[PDB]
Structures are given as structure tokens and as C-alpha cells.
């Protein structure tokens, strides 16, 4: 009637990728962590645009939508910030948002590429990930002009998918089909998984009636906003705070 004793092993760790193996954990817990990677990890992204001049070939909502999807490095200040709905300011203060400014005009005979290199922020720690190519925003002819002011709030991927900090979360358990959770009409047509521990002749592991899914394999790839280790840690802390607040509310209700 007690908790488990999970263990981890990090197979590969780079600047955009973490591969690890969780063991001695329940499938529900593993999948809940997998879901929290995608949805409930706070990220800084642009959420308020005011276009002073737009003589380009894309309309204002098009440009604003493109601006929203440029990822900003929120490695360290995403914890410090507050939600704009949770702040004492009127609309925006430095404690709950980061302000951006873009002002580009083309006066040459060559098409100019307005990229994320041109977004300028007041805080030096929240900058587009392509500022230590570039994310193209719009192209300008001669005489066309763009100028705007934007504000970067804080949020997570349940609200909008621009706050989703990951690129592809590969989740897989039981690479050899020893638990028969999926049934193959022909087992020999199916390619073996990357983590399979079988020979070149045997296709499926023999059935294991007294087994449960353990040893989940992950691969969390980051979209550049957070680094792929803080995505995992923020998910374990982020899920842990959801359970704690549930326990607080239950204790009030019982009493």
C-alpha cells in the first residue's frame, strides 16, 4: 500500500536531447510525466502585439501569429516571473512580462529578410534561441516597412501550443512484446525496436503472464526554449505541485 522506488539512467545527453530509462514505476506515472512534458511546463512566449506600421505583403494577424511562435530563451527567469493574471500591476510590468521591439525598413533594391535577429528585448536573458540561421518573419520589398511592440508573458502548453517547450517526446515501454499489449497478425513483418534484446531470428519474446509494464524509455527533444534537462525536472516538480494542492483542498473539505 506504499509508493514505488523508481530509478533512472541517462543514456544520452546533448544540447537538444535527453534519452533516459525510468524503472520500477507504474505506467500511469510514466505516462503522466510524458503528458506533463508537453502541456504543463511554463515557457515565455509573445502574447501581445501592437503593430505601428505594416506595409508588408502579410496582414497584421499573420505577422502576429508568426511572432508568437518564435521561441525565447526562458532557461532561468521562467521561475522568477509571475502570471499576468496573478500580478499586482495594471497591464504589464517587468516582474510579469518581457517587452520586445521590432523596427525594420527596406530602402535597397534587394529583398530584405526580416528575421528573429531583429527582435530586441529589454531583458538580456530572454532572447530568441537563434541569437545565441535565423527564424524568418517576413520579407520586404523596396519601400515596405514593419514596426511593432510586443510583450512576452508566461504560460504553459495547455493554454496555447506556443508555450509547448518540446519538439518530439518519444515514449516506449516493453520493446519486445512480452506482455502482449499489442497483438501482431504476422509478427515477422514488424521491424524490431531500437531497444530490442532479441536475436536475428526470433521476432517476439515469449509470453510472460505474471508481468507488468516496467522500464519505460524516454527521448525528450527540446525546441530550444528550455534545455532538455530542465524540461524533465520542471515536469517532476510541476506534477508534484498539482498533487500537493489537491491534498490541501481535500484536507479543508474533510474537516
Amino acid at each position: 500500500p506504499y509508493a514505488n522506488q523508481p530509478t533512472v539512467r541517462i543514456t544520452e545527453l546533448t544540447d537538444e536531447n535527453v534519452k533516459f530509462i525510468i524503472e520500477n514505476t507504474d505506467l500511469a506515472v510514466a505516462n503522466s510525466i510524458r503528458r506533463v512534458f508537453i502541456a504543463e511546463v511554463p515557457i515565455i512566449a509573445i502574447d501581445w502585439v501592437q503593430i505601428d506600421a505594416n506595409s508588408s505583403v502579410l496582414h497584421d494577424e499573420f505577422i502576429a501569429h508568426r511572432l508568437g511562435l518564435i521561441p525565447l530563451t526562458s532557461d532561468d527567469i521562467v521561475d522568477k516571473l509571475q502570471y499576468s493574471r496573478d500580478c499586482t500591476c495594471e497591464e504589464f510590468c517587468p516582474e510579469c512580462s518581457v517587452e520586445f521591439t521590432l523596427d525594420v525598413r527596406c530602402n535597397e533594391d534587394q529583398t530584405r529578410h526580416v528575421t528573429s535577429r531583429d527582435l530586441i528585448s529589454n531583458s538580456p536573458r530572454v532572447i530568441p534561441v537563434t541569437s545565441r540561421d535565423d527564424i524568418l518573419i517576413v520579407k520586404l520589398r523596396k519601400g515596405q516597412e514593419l514596426r511593432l511592440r510586443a510583450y512576452a508573458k508566461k504560460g504553459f502548453g495547455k493554454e496555447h501550443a506556443k508555450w509547448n517547450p518540446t519538439a518530439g517526446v518519444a515514449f516506449e515501454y516493453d520493446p519486445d512484446n512480452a506482455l502482449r499489449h499489442t497483438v501482431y497478425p504476422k509478427p515477422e513483418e514488424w521491424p524490431k525496436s531500437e531497444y530490442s534484446e532479441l536475436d536475428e531470428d526470433e521476432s517476439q519474446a515469449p509470453y510472460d503472464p505474471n508481468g507488468k509494464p516496467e522500464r519505460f524509455y524516454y527521448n525528450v527533444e527540446s525546441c530550444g526554449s528550455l534545455r532538455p534537462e530542465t524540461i524533465v525536472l520542471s515536469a517532476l516538480s510541476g506534477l508534484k505541485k498539482k498533487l500537493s494542492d489537491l491534498q490541501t483542498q481535500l484536507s479543508h473539505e474533510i474537516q
Binding site: 511562435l69 540561421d133 519538439a167 518530439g168 525546441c223
Partner: protein
């Protein structure tokens, strides 16, 4: 119209790869080799570059109002 910033299916950023992709193609690369070189690993990301039609080049031909 213009290449999207993110891949629709998974969210990997493909909005900074169109110029590099065109340059690789101009440098005598096959499309498969160019996509492999740019790091587009899964077909959801690969189709974003394979099937893109860049109309903003055509839209830039017409003179602006001002």
C-alpha cells in the same frame, strides 16, 4: 505563402531552414540528402520542406501602394 515557423505535427522549428534548403539544392544535393543534412529526421518534419510552395516571392513582384 511563407514557410511556417513550426512543424504542424510535432512543433520542431522549420522556419529557419528554407534558405539553407534552397542553397543545398542549388549546391547539387538530392532532396533526401539535403533533408538529412538539415537534421529533419521524421517525415512529419520532412514534408514541411518537401511540399512547401513559396508564393511570397511572387507577391513581392507587385509594387507597393506607397
Amino acid at each position: 505563402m511563407i514557410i511556417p515557423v513550426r512543424c504542424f505535427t510535432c512543433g520542431k522549428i522549420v522556419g529557419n531552414k528554407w534558405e539553407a534548403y534552397l542553397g543545398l539544392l542549388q549546391a547539387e544535393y538530392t532532396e533526401g540528402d539535403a533533408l538529412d543534412a538539415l537534421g529533419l529526421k521524421r517525415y512529419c518534419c520532412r514534408r514541411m520542406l518537401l511540399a512547401h510552395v513559396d508564393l511570397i516571392e511572387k507577391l513581392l513582384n507587385y509594387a507597393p501602394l506607397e
